Structure formats: structure tokens, C-alpha cells
Symmetry: D2
Subunit: 283 residues, 4 copies
């Protein structure tokens, strides 16, 4: 499987979205699992999940790596509402366009916020819910905010440079030996390729700051069986939010990886794939 | 598999122990996994693990459910050293007697303390390390100590009664509908059958209080790949100790079950078995 | 100052309350400080605060130790709304009746919930806000709930006895040598004297469980300078809620006493009085 | 009081130190309080404590703002042991030279580590112990380490620049409007004035990394009445270490300031002075 061979586009129409172009990468043909990426400059579906797509397809799932609005090859957008909600409407729009009745959701960071909002807004359209360091869940009980990684994400959006990208990735990942030239060049290309996305992210964030993303008060509504992952060493979203989710969602479990930053599905791909596939099959 | 069909005895000889009788329940014939039980009145190997033995044997392991010294059908003993250490010497004595070179250890509560001490004292004799709410790891950062469940454990040791047993089990388990007459009668029988164990546990605890069990300072020595489980709702050992282990052991992961007290392998048997078998096979 | 010499009654009229009798103990004549007691069987203003009234009066304050509705010498009541809110309406009713424009509030446990609700509902009527282990702030990130002490409080309400009272007080206080016959007899008398309050508390709790008291989502509205105290060893309300308040109220500080249960103003009276008087004078 | 009018030098002789020059700023003549500064480039006694010296002297104390070895106007040094311990020997050497029998200690960050080590090594020479975000207390249960601020401290030591200084101070302080030109110029001057201190700090840290400073296991030895302060928003040392100290030192209390970084005595000078003076007078 490659980015090119799996690449697809679909126009969506859903509250606010009109003939809005969504790029996604699709492989497999079984039950649908939609994987949703983080919010850093240059993020996208394939980039975030290329270590996960193969094993999930092998396990029998249809995998859709979705580019959220204002990221990668999806259409540019300026949002005036919290991004998790707007992103979730876009997931529903994609599912309606593709005739998908229910999907399992896997959501990393901003994508975790997207997945939580989808579960809340469209409970009849979700199967299981998988969350990796989801963002926006209000204050931490321990971590000063904005968190270290989030400050870097905003710096890179406002003043993109290869050096600042490297600085962000150093904080993003626990193991520094994972920061290859391939990783750096790929992220830099995605940043260079769509400067409009960077500008629009910042305009959006002024319209709806992260303090407006907090869905904590509604977590008791979630009936989806939920699997929460955290990196012990995540400098972008605080570890205690994994506990927050565990206490507030009816049927959740929490798995924390040691020596792991904000990209658990990539940093601990083998264990992540095994745990999440097991969860989807048997939970 | 039944308690009767799996029951075995072996005499051990290891630092302090001389011709000391250890009862255990054994099934299977593959790689050895020794499961170690908690320290409550009436605890024993079969009692603690009868929901786990079958699936582990099915997966290809030789399972040994060991009765620790001063519990169930093992010999009575008064200990003047911290129980985790004394128990670990007994595990080594069992392994030497049975010609087992290396074992995977699964340790619940007192058994978790036993497993940690074994890993520290005999690093060449352990495979993987699995811990479920291990005891003795010093103070909590959040929970007043002694913890609610531990106060009940000491009350029941000092004044055994069916009513106090029921009170303990109510705190021990999250889901109250798991407290069947079968569970109550079984635990009560084990308590009635060996009053000497109750007396000796209390004498031992005066000689070496729980404050002497803390092995925290040595956790950096552990090289075994480690899987830590906690019940979100554990009233016997504090949740933050799962984080303590995760930060201090080199290669650990932490899995926390929702709606789960101090007997995770029984309260969440299906998910526990799947996760731990996966860990042993693939980690 | 004695309970008898300070005792007063006032009828209040405020949303729902009509000619409702409130008992309080008053001393001093300076700026008003209203102290609000916890929700355990037999609780009352004088009982809860008799170690604080003198020093606060000496410092120049008018101190009002208020009995909340359905406690001590205040009128019996069955509430169908969360108690913090109903109690706060009663504080406003008292203040209107006594021509008090603004009061500093000191609130222990249920009284802390009362004080938070008052600050939210009547921001123009509060000076400073002092909270000692306030209840109802939703789930803990660490403590299984209901907390140990709260289970005992409900047991004692449903089946009042001198033995169960002693059991509660043992959990309520860190230092067991504070549990004198005077303390036990006083609490028992207050329980025996008004059995109707016990019955009504339970009926009220069925109508509006503690899960309905959570005001967390509104904490950002509080503009009062706030001083939060916690007992390190509080088995009734979880320590992490002190952090919750510290992160969510604009201008707060948190003081945690070691060797201290759920009655900080009594267990650590000297340090409490000094800190809170300093806060009122200088903050 | 000014830096110039209070400036003094004394040669110390104590295990390892021989005719070693210590600079300090002294005012007042009552009971001695020695204040100990943090470990950032350009730190010193006067710099760290000039908002505290006056009020403490007014309260009747003799205040000594000590420059630790390898800082400010004290002699340059390369240490091969953990700095808290070496610093504590230097405090004892100062006290012996000045004929001070016992001192109260106030210790910020590295200075907190110094104060803890002094309390452990010389229990007969300390009065009360005051700690503000003390360093070196091992891992956090929540914060990825090295902490954000500590990474910046090492960056500034290795590559001193005015821009990197400003970056550090932005993380050091909660309120950005406290970062005046006066603050920046003062810190920069202290950095420019003694480049040898920067080089030596780095050589020392290679000889004895922060992982060797952890005195956690010995905290039960401390008999000094202890007052612990933390900034809620401290990005240099983790908030949960305040709890660690509170649980492990016999007689401690914890005060946490909101909207406060790693320089609590300066960021919240008025409340800090009042609380600590009250503690020294009455605790
Ligand atoms: Na490699
Ligand atoms: Na059933
Ligand atoms: Na006494
Ligand atoms: Na100003």
C-alpha cells in the first residue's frame, strides 16, 4: 500500500460544508475504521497512520485515513467553531457520501477531539472509539498550559521553518533517533505545499481558542466502548486527561506506553496495532 | 481443570526455608507462568486465579498457581522480614525443586510485591513480569493510608467473621453482583480451615510492617519487560502507584480497567487474559 | 463565648423558603464572616466552629456560625434540589433579614459546596471565599467514589448508633487522640435530638444525589479572592479537588495541612485561624 | 538596603572547601535566616531575594542571602558530587565562620535541594525549613522530564545569549509583564560577568547528573518544621513533588500559588513574605 495507490477524493455536504473536497487514503474492504490525524502543521492521514494501515487491513478492516478540513489535500477552510466539532461534521459528511452506516474511530490529538465530538453528535453512527492523547479536554490538574508542545505548534504555524519543525518534532517524539531526514523532509514538504492551511489554522484559532473545545461536561453521554492510549512522555497533551476520560466515559480502558511522546501509534506501532485490533475484535 | 485435579505439593529449601511444604495447582506443559496471589485472609492460588488458568493453558503455557507461605495449603510460618522478599525466596525454592530455569510471573497485590522482589533478587530467573495492583510501594501521592481495603483486611485477620468477610469483599470488588454465596462460602471455608494462618499473619506484620516492604528505590534495576494492571476503583492499593511503576521500571506499560476493584484478573478476566497472553507472546 | 450566649434565631424568606427558622451563633460586630458547616449527622455551626469563633472575633470580625436547613436547630426540610444551592439561598435569606450587604464565607465540606453556590448565585453579596474540603465537585482523578467517609456518613444517617458514630469520627479525624468522650457525646446528643433531620437528609439525597451537586463547569465565574484548604489525609473529599479549584477559580491559593482529616479548622485550628485571618486582612 | 551596602565576603573551610570565598548579602541582626538561590545562569542571592530581604529584616530577622559556590560573586568551582550536598557543606562552612549555631533556611529550586541536604546532614544546625519548588526529587508522576524549564536552563548555560535568556525567563515567570528591561539586563550582566561559572556548571552536571540529586529516600529523617511552596504554573519543577514532600516529611504544610512560575518569592512576594514570616514566628 502506498499513499498514491490509496488516495481518493470525495465532496461532502453537511451542516456548513457545501461541495467541500475531502482527501482520504483507503485500503481494505471489511468493517470501516476511520483514522483521524493530529493538528500540527503538515499533518495528514497517510503521514500520521502509514504504520497502522497495513496491519488493520490485514486484520480485515476497511481503513480510511481522512484528511481533516484545512489539512493536507483536503480543501482550505477558516473555522469559527471549535475544530473537533467542525471536523466531526466532516466525518459524517464523508460517511454519508460513501454510504457508511457506522464506523470505528481512531483519533490522535486533534483527531481525538474530532472522535469525541463525533461520538457525542452522532452516537448511532459510531462503533468503537479509540483515542490517543485527545486534545481540548480543558485544564490539566498538573501541567502548566499551554503545554510545551502546543506552544511549539503555534510557533511553527506562525513562522514555519525547517529548524522550528525539527524543534517541534524533538518535543513530539520521545526517541530522538526516530527523527530521520525522511520524517523531516516529508513534514516540511506538507508545510511548504500548503501555506494557506497554516494561515487559516491561526485565523481559526483566534475565532475559537482551544478553551472552547472542552467537551468534558458531555462525556457521560458516550455509550461507545472506548480505548484510550497515552504516551507517558507526551508534552502536548497532559497524562491526567487519560484519567479524566477513564472516570467520565462509561466503558473505557486506559493504556499508557512508556518512552512515548505524542505519536503513540507510530512510536509504539506494533503494540498499538495489536492492542487496538484485539479491542475491535473482542471488546 | 479443577482444584483437586491440579493440586500438588513440593518441599522447598532456600535461605531460611528447610523442608517447607508449598502447595500449588499446576496445569499445562509449555513455558512456565507462576501466578502469585494476594494477602487477604483465605487467599490462595486456585481461589485467586481459577478464571485465568484455563485460557493461559489453552494458549500453551504451563501454569503454576502457587500458595505463598502462611496461606491456604502451604505450611504455616511467622515471618520477621517483609513478606514480598520471603515469598520471592519461596518462589525460587519452588523453581529449583521443579527444575524450572526461568518463569514469567503474574502477581496480584501481595503477589505483585512478591513478583517485584523476585525480579530484583533473581533477575536471571525471570522472563516477563506482570503486576496487578502490587502492594507495599510506599506512600500514595493522593490516597490516605492505610487504605480503606487494607484496614478491612487487618480487621478480618484479627476478628474473622462471615459479616466482616462480606464487608471486605464489598470493598474488594467494584461490581457487587459478583459477590455470590459461592464466593463468600469459599473464602469463609479457607478462613475457617486455617486459623493459624490468620494469627501468624498478624504476628508477622508486627515484626515487619508494610512500611518495610517498599522496594521503590530499587525499581531501576528491573530489566524484565513489565505489564502493569490497575483497577480504576481499587480501594486497597492506590492508582498512582501504577504511574510510579511506569516511570521507574525501564520497560513497562500500564493498563487501567474501569469499573474494577482489587481483583482485576477475576473482575475483568476476558480482557486480562487476552492482554496478558498477547504480552507474553509478542512483547 | 458559649453556644448559649451566642445563640440566635431568624426567620428567612427567599425563593422557596417562607417564614423558615434559621438558628445561628453570633459574636463580634465588625465585618461579617459567615461560617458554614459540614453535612454529617449531628453537624451544626457551633459544633463545627467553636475553635474558630473566638480568634476571628478577637481579630475584629462579626462571626455568624449558621445552621443550614435540616441541621441542628434550624427548621427541618426535605430538599429536591442539590443541597449546596438550597443552602446558599438560605444564606442570602439570612443576610437579607439581618441587613448584611456582603459577607466573607468560610465553608467546610457541604458548607464549601454552599459557599461555592453562594459565590456563583450572588456574586455581589460575597467578599472573600474560604473553602475547606468542599464537597460535590464531581469525580476524583484518583479516589474511588463514594469515598470511604461518605459511605460512613450515609450508614450513620440510615442507622444511627453510638458505635457507628465512633466509626465515622475515626475516619473523619487524622489524630485519634482527638476523639474524646466530650466530642462523641456532643455529636450523639445532636443526632438523638433531631431524628427527623436524619430521615429528611436521606429523602433529600434520593431526590438530588451528590452527582447533581457538581458546579465545576461554572467555577470560571467566581471573581471572589479564594483560599482553599485541604487535609492531606481527608477520607471524605479527594485531595485532587483542591487542585481542581486552584486551576479553575481565577484568584485562588491552596493550603494543605499534613496529619489532617476532614475537619481542618478544628484539627489545625491555630494555623487555620492565622492563615485565614491573614487572608481576610491582607489578600 | 542595597546590594552594595549589604555585600560581604567570608572564606570557608569545610569538607573539600579550603579558603573558599563565599559572597553573601546581609541585613538585620535577629535570628538568622539564610536564603538560598536557584541554579539558573546568572542566579545569585541578592537577585533572587531582593523583594524578601526588607520585610524579613523588618520582622526582626538577620537575613543572609548566600551566593552558592560557582554562582555570582562566590568562588568558581567544578563539583563531582550532587550540587545540593556540596552547597549544604558550604552553608555549614559559612555558619561556622560567622559563629551561627542554628539557621532557618529558605531554599528556592537548587537552593531547595541545598536546604533539604543541609537538614539531612546537619539536623542540629537548622531551625525551620522553607522550600520553594525544590529540585532533584527524582521523577514526576505526571511531568515528562527533563522539564521544559530545565531544558532551557541547559541551553542557556551552553550557549548564552540575550535572546535565549529572554526565552528562559518567559518560561520561568507566569506573568510576562514582569519581564522588564531591568530584569533582563541584570540577569544578562551576571551571565556576562562570569563566563567561567557557566562552563563549570556544565562540567559539574556531567560529573553528577540531576538523577543523582534525589534525596527522596531520606525525607523521613527530617525533623524540622517545614513549609513547602509551589507555583501552580511552575515549568521547571513538577507540582506533584510538593505532594511528595508533604507525604514524606513528618511536619510539613504545602502552599500553592495560582498564576505563579518558578520564582514564587518574587512573583508573589507579599503573600510569600506574610506566610513565611507567620510560619517562622508561630509554627
Ligand atoms: Na535505529
Ligand atoms: Na449476573
Ligand atoms: Na492530648
Ligand atoms: Na505593571
Amino acid at each position: 500500500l502506498t499513499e498514491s495507490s490509496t488516495s481518493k477524493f470525495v465532496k461532502i455536504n453537511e451542516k456548513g460544508f457545501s461541495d467541500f473536497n475531502i482527501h482520504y487514503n483507503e485500503a481494505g474492504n471489511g468493517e470501516t475504521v476511520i483514522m483521524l490525524h493530529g493538528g500540527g502543521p503538515g499533518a495528514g492521514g497517510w503521514s500520521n497512520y502509514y504504520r497502522n494501515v497495513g496491519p488493520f487491513v490485514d486484520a480485515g478492516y476497511r481503513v480510511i485515513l481522512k484528511d481533516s478540513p484545512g489539512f493536507n489535500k483536503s480543501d482550505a477552510v477558516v473555522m469559527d467553531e471549535q475544530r473537533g466539532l467542525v471536523n466531526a461534521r466532516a466525518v459524517k459528511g464523508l460517511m454519508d457520501a460513501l454510504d457508511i452506516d457506522r464506523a470505528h474511530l481512531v483519533g490522535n490529538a486533534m483527531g481525538g477531539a474530532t472522535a469525541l465530538n463525533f461520538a457525542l453528535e452522532y452516537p448511532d453512527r459510531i462503533g468503537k472509539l479509540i483515542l490517543m492523547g485527545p486534545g481540548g479536554l480543558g485544564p490539566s490538574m498538573f501541567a502548566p498550559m499551554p503545554m510545551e508542545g502546543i506552544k511549539l505548534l503555534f510557533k511553527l504555524y506562525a513562522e514555519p521553518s525547517y529548524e522550528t519543525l525539527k524543534q517541534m518534532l524533538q518535543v513530539f517524539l520521545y526517541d530522538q533517533s526516530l527523527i530521520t531526514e525522511e520524517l523531516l523532509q516529508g513534514r516540511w514538504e506538507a508545510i511548504q505545499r500548503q501555506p494557506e492551511h497554516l494561515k487559516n489554522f491561526l485565523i481559526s484559532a483566534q475565532k475559537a481558542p482551544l478553551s472552547t473545545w472542552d467537551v468534558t461536561a458531555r462525556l457521560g453521554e458516550i455509550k461507545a466502548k472506548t480505548f484510550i492510549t497515552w504516551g507517558r512522555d507526551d508534552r502536548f497533551v497532559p497524562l491526567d486527561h487519560g484519567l479524566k476520560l477513564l472516570w467520565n466515559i462509561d466503558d473505557a480502558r486506559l493504556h499508557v506506553f512508556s518512552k512515548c511522546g505524542h505519536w503513540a501509534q507510530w512510536e509504539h506501532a506494533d503494540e498499538f496495532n495489536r492492542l487496538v485490533i484485539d479491542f475491535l475484535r473482542h471488546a
